[PDB]
Symmetry: D2
Subunit: 430 residues, 4 copies
């Protein structure tokens, strides 16, 4: 085994560092002057445009599909660098990547070519979004005997009609709330939403994914697609994840990601599994920023003492703990993404590895930021340092992209409970 980065991986890092260093660094000056979530988001459009220009959006699509993605390892390296500087715009990129994953994973060349085109063109500010989350929650969306998703779809002729509400999906409403360039709406098939989901059926067999573009939205009545609100977040204040309501929203049958059922649910699961693995790079990035800033401070400040505070064991212990969390996190992420790319491995093995990664990396990231603040002391509580922003943003990772308590841990539990569970299949094989 080896951990020596290839020339292209080293370049991806270099390129990624130069980007946010010369681009993202100027982001705050713009959105910091906005009064609301949406305004802040829109203020980042120019920076997203640059991301596109630098080919960071095209890098989210596989080469075989006209993109420039090299591997999940390159992507993890790039994300770490971006989040280590500015999550703004960087989060918009990962959001788009998620929105594209279902199409990238489906087995319909014509569908991919048609919907991925604006993302591989390298121009404009194409936004993608995987609309799954709902106001009532989704941790139990696959619970047999449960209500199931409240966003339902029914086939009426050569088209589908969507009804329901979504909440949290990133960039779902695009820059101007008239829809994202591409949205994968996850729905539960139901000819009559008024009637509860059959408690005897497997919820996964009721899943359908409908591709919704700005064109789709413009072909519908205005009251068929509307944004009820834009949540004000504690951190990631420039991100958009509106509360959207679909009322008799018509979608062409040609926009069906795939045959409703297990195949559709499998695509959503695969997309979220790959995302869970990459979320680690985001947590590491944010946590690393705190660590390096505390490290720099501890090695150059005595706090009125006779020596740099890093000389005090208690301070060093905190920093040591931070370093270890980051190091173990990155290794787990790399192992996860590489495991996901190993065709010879069973999906259950890949899913477990991805779940572990998301759970661990997001939990310790919070601890790392807090410990860094304790080591720095009172000064870390003022806005003149990065810590205030970092705490609010790191607290999002353990909650988003499938909270650890309600979703990820449960998905992992399920796999571990299987009779043929192979604990170390991803390491020593079978």
């Amino acid at each position: 085994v080896d951990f020596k980065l290839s020339p292209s991986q080293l370049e991806a890092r270099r390129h990624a560092q130069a980007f946010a260093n010369t681009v993202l660094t100027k982001a705050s000056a713009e959105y910091s002057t906005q009064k609301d979530q949406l305004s802040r988001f829109q203020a980042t459009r120019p920076f997203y445009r640059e991301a596109v220009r630098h080919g960071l959006i095209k890098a989210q699509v596989p080469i075989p599909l006209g993109g420039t993605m090299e591997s999940l390892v390159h992507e993890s390296i790039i994300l770490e660098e971006l989040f280590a500087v500015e999550p703004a715009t960087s989060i918009t990129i990962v959001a788009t990547a998620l929105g594209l994953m279902p199409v990238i994973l489906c087995d319909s060349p014509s569908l991919q070519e048609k919907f991925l085109k604006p993302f591989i063109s390298g121009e404009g500010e194409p936004l993608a979004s995987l609309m799954h989350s709902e106001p009532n929650g989704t941790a139990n969306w696959l619970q047999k005997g449960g209500p199931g998703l409240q966003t339902t779809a029914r086939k009426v002729g050569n088209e589908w009609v969507i009804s329901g509400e979504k909440l949290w999906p990133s960039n779902s409403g695009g820059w101007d709330y008239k829809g994202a360039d591409l949205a994968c709406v996850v729905c539960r098939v139901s000819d009559d939403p008024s009637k509860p989901q059959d408690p005897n059926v497997d919820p996964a067999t009721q899943i359908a994914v409908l591709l919704v573009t700005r064109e789709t939205i413009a072909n519908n009545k205005k009251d068929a697609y509307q944004i009820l609100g834009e949540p004000e977040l504690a951190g990631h204040i420039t991100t958009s994840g509106p509360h959207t309501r679909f009322t008799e929203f018509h979608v062409p049958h040609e926009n069906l990601l795939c045959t409703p059922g297990l195949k559709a649910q499998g695509l959503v699961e695969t997309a979220f599994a790959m995302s869970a693995a990459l979320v680690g790079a985001m947590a590491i990035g944010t946590a690393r920023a705190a660590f390096e800033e505390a490290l720099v401070f501890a090695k150059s400040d005595t706090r009125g003492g006779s020596k740099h505070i890093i000389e005090h064991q208690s301070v060093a212990d905190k920093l040591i703990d931070c370093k270890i969390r980051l190091e173990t996190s990155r290794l787990l992420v790399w192992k996860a993404v590489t495991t996901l790319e190993d065709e010879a491995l069973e999906w259950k093995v890949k899913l477990e590895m991805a779940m572990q990664t998301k759970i661990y990396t997001t939990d310790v990231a919070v601890e790392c930021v807090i410990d860094a603040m304790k080591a720095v002391g009172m000064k870390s509580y003022a806005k003149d340092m990065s810590f205030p922003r970092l705490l609010n943003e790191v607290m999002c990772y353990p909650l988003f992209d499938g909270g650890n308590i309600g979703l990820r841990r449960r998905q992992m539990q399920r796999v571990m409970a299987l009779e043929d569970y192979e604990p170390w299949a991803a390491t020593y094989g079978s």
Copy 2:
């Protein structure tokens, strides 16, 4: 041994609750429309004025001195209730109480009856502040051979001349930056601030506390007392702890709190030890609000499932951990405050108990808020819930009023290292 509350204490809670729900609840609507810390602080004045009218300020001065204080247990019960609703103004009350303690503890009836007059009248909005913290830090202010406090004082004629800068002292500048009604400036005696502190002289033996009032500031040149800035805090955004600079600031000798040296340092230590214990009440209040909001949510929301999330063991485990943290914390606080009033115990014993409380309560309060958020899930990240504000505010406790890593733990370590260390003196007597 018993824990039953007396009618006096039960009344304190009710009054604290009534005040917090009638006055404090309306604070947000006022300071939320302000742009900066200072403006947000000034916006809380009408609320501080109401606190004074409710005798909350006079309740910070012991009856013998003209106040109406009943006990530290009453004060803790009050603080828990106030902070469980709105830290704004509440933090101002505790700040004034701290700046008052030095005078309350000194054995000079003359200074007391003179400088405690405006705080017991029950009129206006008198602010007191203990100016100790400095821009370079204070965790090593007593280290032998170190730089020592940067705020020095020298005797010139029949008055003292202060030179140096202070940073973080609450309400130190007052409502209009013209100085707090009463300020206890902690300085290091030095005839020449140009030369470093004598490395062969014990720092504590050179500590002096000068009382500075608005009048004192008015009797000096405008450039002798200047506010250099107001730090933007991540939490407790309505507090004021400016960066003050003293330049040949002349103070009457009659304003010396006590003899310079160990007696002055003792007053400061004692004041900070008492506040350190009461901080636990503030931490509990903040952490309780998070626990309760999460508890209510878990017993009323199913998150799209078939049952309330509290029925999920993982969720219950989180709520249970928060409950235990809050429970153990309140008991510790109560034990600490009582121990501090037990004149049958040596100071080292009281000190150690006070440090234990501050270290434990503030540390677990952070974990309690975070665990609660993880239980609630994604929705806890939206500002429509209290969690966003609670997280920011709670992260201040482990850092302020003497950080745990640099100050409190060191103070406790010192006592434990002593030859006559009595581990359980506060419990099973000495």
Copy 3:
């Protein structure tokens, strides 16, 4: 609010200390030469006798019933001192107290008078045991639809026939496997053992507690009561809790503790709820012994350095954390035992407090011992120090007397799930 110990409580500690230092300290030299669990337990008999003579068994019975129990706080204080020195015999005293509680709590004066007699006489060495635990576990014994207790009682004429196996009940077989002087066998009423429990009837309504004595066993066939094995434990190597098999074991109807059903289940719950609060005293005692031995070592050993290791911040941090855990634990236990004795509080509130105590104290105790060993270093791993023993014994508390994960946390979760759940009822009343 008062933590001042009365003269009787202070006297209880002194008495326990004297007993521990004069008697318990000599136990090790006796059982250490035995090659098995039973033999080691028997070797402690000549030590239990002393406990009886000192009135330790009599102190397990309330005064109104002929005992000398002063209060649970006295018991808490006594157990801490006893376990801080030697778990041997001390655990046997706790075991007897548990086996006596059902009778102590029942509403049958005649029954109490009859069966408690040999325990309040202060003669010989009477052993009591609450036989509840079984080979298949008991965490789900009250689970509706589950198999329930595998030890069942069948009413045959004027006698009860017991069938099934018990495992873990402390000293249930007495000193010679001829049975404890008094055993409270918790059974599930079943007219036909070969048939599974009825999934339509609440398990709690089928619980019966049968009193079994050495006489009852003598009145039965030899193989109607047999010890199948004596588990070799990791710690508390002198305790007895055999695997017992009841085959057509006849028990006089008069030996029925009370009316089968909710009332019987109620007695078992209250008994285990009271012990759950007291185990905290046992955990504190074992952890205190580790902390004190690490503290003494740290204050007198430099480990080849130039100063006592307690001067190193990392060592101090460990000691500080152990002290806090011990401090918060004792306060919780006292609050719990005090709450349990408050006749003005609903059972729900008392049970909740008892669960919090058992969960917190036993969990934190394990960390306290481990941290003490890390602070001491390599030396703590040799049997020339007492850590090796403290580690194995402390690890028992989280698992025994109702495991935290399967039983205690679940009982607490249930209480919190209730619609009328009052979080702070035990502190601020209703």
Copy 4:
């Protein structure tokens, strides 16, 4: 970046598993009957003999030196499989590897060829030991101005005379207390052991390593080399780490490992850094055995419930936490040993990675065994399950091979304090 294993690495795992299953599993039945440490240690000799015959000893010496070690990753895999079954003998192999390390790392083919010969012959049961640890401790053996090592050496004619005592060195005395086939005694140069170390000279410059064989001991007076005792350990009851007291022990000048000073200290530091990295493999092996035993139990036992306990979220949470700690640990170890073999990275980087590994893996392994026990419940406390043994064995890891609190963390803190500290050098290059 790649984690895939080569055919040789998989073969190494299969070979280790076969050896542990066909040989190590029979060790317990042999040493369990012995009464003391030495006797137990001696009972493992036949098993160590088999290890030799299986070439496991020769596999501790690099291929360029005539050994058969393929790489540190192969070694890490072998150790994990061995310790997952039986630490006995396995720990002996590890001890020998550390003892040979100083010679393996020195730049003298002549010395290497001469002293490594018995260990690569593939016959007998040769033991090696790195004698560094002492009765007074060694955490501050390099502290400037401190006592320093108490085992001193002085040059007399064409040979050296050793004076002092060693405590803990594994197999230092050999199978019959006549000495290990090879021992690297770490001494502090001093012409007069009665005089204190010069507080003006860097301790590292006075370090000397002398090679002592059974022949060396046999060529000295019986009173010059004597075992003063064999500590009884809580775990790893078959390991030997005598208390030796060199008295005017004469060693040939040619047996000097290298020139006294930083070079000698460098060899010790390097040897211990590599051991620290491999210790993680041992911790993983032990923790893995606990995890797997609890996993199997949780999937096949309902504990009197209606479903396997793994179906309970609190139980799954414990197993998930264990799995994650194991996964992150193996990855950190593989990364560490790989970093150690990277000739492109400077020492400080390799050292930092090695310390992080020892610190994380050993600490986390303890938590894993405990969580596994809490998951299984009461049954884990009985010796009919392996948990009791695993708990005692895992607790040694955080303390031995350089405790984390006194040595490892201090070594890491030293590196991080360096002005040229490159946090991510091992990952993203310099």
